[PDB]
Swiss-Prot record, chain B:
Taxonomy of the source species: Eukaryota, Metazoa, Chordata, Craniata, Vertebrata
Post-translational modification: The N-terminus is blocked.
Keyword annotations of the record: Acetylation, Activator, Biological rhythms, Chromosomal rearrangement, Coiled coil, Cytoplasm, DNA damage, DNA recombination, DNA repair, DNA-binding, Immunity, Innate immunity, Isopeptide bond, Methylation, mRNA processing, mRNA splicing, Nucleus, Phosphoprotein, Repeat, Repressor, RNA-binding, Transcription, Transcription regulation, Ubl conjugation
A biological process from GO: RNA splicing
Domain comment quoted from the record: The coiled coil domain mediates interaction with NONO, and can also mediate formation of long, linear homooligomers (in vitro). The coiled coil domain is required for optimal DNA binding, and optimal transcription activation.
Record's protein name: Splicing factor, proline- and glutamine-rich
Linked residues for Glycyl lysine isopeptide (Lys-Gly) (interchain with G-Cter in SUMO2): K7, K66
Primary gene name: SFPQ
GO cellular component, one term: nucleus
Keyword match Oxidoreductase: no
Subcellular location: Nucleus speckle; Nucleus matrix; Cytoplasm
Species name: Homo sapiens
Function description: DNA- and RNA binding protein, involved in several nuclear processes. Essential pre-mRNA splicing factor required early in spliceosome formation and for splicing catalytic step II, probably as a heteromer with NONO. Binds to pre-mRNA in spliceosome C complex, and specifically binds to intronic polypyrimidine tracts. Involved in regulation of signal-induced alternative splicing.
Outcome of swapping L263A: Impairs DNA binding and ability to mediate transcriptional activation
Source species, domain of life: Eukaryota
Phosphotyrosine PTM sites in chain numbering: Y21
Length: 268, 270
RNA sequence: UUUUUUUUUU
RNA sequence: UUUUUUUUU
């Protein structure tokens, strides 16, 4: 099995200039009994270094706990999800950041730094990242993870009511909520059992479709629909880029055909 | 920075149930000499434990190297990016992942394990994952990091071209390439410099727009086009989901109404 | 052409 | 031959 850690380990597990006990560290353990104590929890993750921001709603059997690093936590979940524990089996996963903001239409020269500079005005930041492609050039979209949920909510309103921008040439930042998901651990078969009918569905083994069946043509149609679904979206995207890609330059006709007209009248 | 104890250390960075020297460990180092040796390259990541498959295109001043954990590479990349080295500053960042597939229209029953159980037939797989929401459930959307590009390629071919399915109730799997991006290290000002005009743009500082113009006005009109782009793509989705959502049932009538058709006809040879 | 800038193998 | 997992301050 996985060694639990060591004091050694703990500083290692700090992903390299990660701030400790980020919200990204907080973990939701659901499913705990009612008479679970404050220190009985905390004991469960004695294993995992000096705990932090810990909390329970005993009435619903659930609670939070921040650990040293996101790596460290992720092991926590690793080691703990589906622990039997007074009959119940604890369910651990990460807590829902919900302070997390996706941002788009960033110039290619927004640096991770500068994004935090900008948005640090709406409060304590936990992290601000500009995303990068396979060659590590900007992809116009970024992440701001906020300290407090007010801080986010205020950055949201402000930036989506008002017009926030970042560099000399003007591109409003478009601040939509980030929706979280896990591609790291995902869904194991472990806990894909304890749903209604794994078997009913999985009773037929992965396979290719018979070049004739109903079940083939059904698919080949559904596919077809989807290929189309794409074609449409792909066209909307193309329509609309073409649409921004035009604008900047016919905008510079509000300042170039509006004076081109008004010039020789006054001092003549 | 630059870590005090290792070896005793590395194993601990490995990940949980990470296959080590996965392609997600593969580092691109670009920007190096004519005259780098192989030896010299590996000696570079001496620090970082047993080196994996490594490779230099001396002809183009770049090479690759796999390290034990994604974890550990991350570090090397960090300790090493921009290292001056006979005239140049080497570039370390993660190499590209050809051999990474996105899958879709995934049964909500499809388990991480099962996913690779299926795909393993096109080649060894490095990992496969069902993505899950905040409430850890299927997003009908997976990932299958493969062995090699051939593997991912035959996997792709055989799934666009054929009709692969995974559970009993027929949902084709939609393999497409999955394109690669870094929500992690991202883009530091560090090297945000070394493009032509950082300043030109950064000259103006992060601000609101002037409730008059002009930058304001161009910006709310850009905002318009956008909310509109949304509306459109929002609809394409609801439209075509309707289309599909229909199909399950409106197909169950090529198989009952073309079949309760052909029973009564021959029932009159009198 | 000092270099950042191209370059991401079967 | 034991229990909140469409419940996340």
């Amino acid at each position: 099995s996985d060694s639990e850690g060591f004091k050694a380990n703990l500083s290692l597990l700090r992903r390299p200039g990660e701030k400790t006990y980020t919200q990204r560290c907080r973990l939701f353990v659901g499913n705990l009994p009612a008479d679970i104590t404050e220190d009985e929890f905390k004991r469960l993750f004695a294993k995992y270094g000096e705990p932090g921001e810990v909390f329970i709603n005993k009435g619903k059997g659930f609670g939070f706990i921040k650990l040293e690093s996101r790596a460290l936590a992720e092991i926590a979940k690793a080691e703990l999800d589906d622990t039997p524990m007074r009959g119940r089996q604890l369910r651990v996963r990460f807590a829902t950041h919900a302070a997390a903001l996706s941002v788009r239409n960033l110039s290619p020269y927004v640096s991770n730094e500068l994004l935090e500079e900008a948005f640090s005005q709406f409060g304590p930041i936990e992290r601000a990242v500009v995303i990068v492609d396979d060659r590590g050039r900007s992809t116009g979209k970024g992440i701001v993870e906020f300290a407090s949920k007010p801080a986010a909510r205020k950055a949201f309103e402000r930036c989506s009511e008002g017009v926030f921008l970042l560099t000399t040439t003007p591109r409003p930042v478009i601040v939509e909520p980030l929706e979280q998901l896990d591609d790291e651990d995902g869904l194991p078969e472990k806990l894909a059992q304890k749903n209604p009918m794994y078997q009913k569905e999985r009773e037929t083994p992965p396979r290719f479709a018979q070049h004739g069946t109903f079940e083939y043509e059904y698919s080949q149609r559904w596919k077809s629909l989807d290929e189309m679904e794409k074609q449409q979206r792909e066209q909307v995207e193309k329509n609309m880029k073409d649409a921004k890609d035009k604008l900047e330059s016919e905008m510079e006709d509000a300042y170039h055909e509006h004076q081109a007209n008004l010039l020789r009248q006054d001092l003549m």
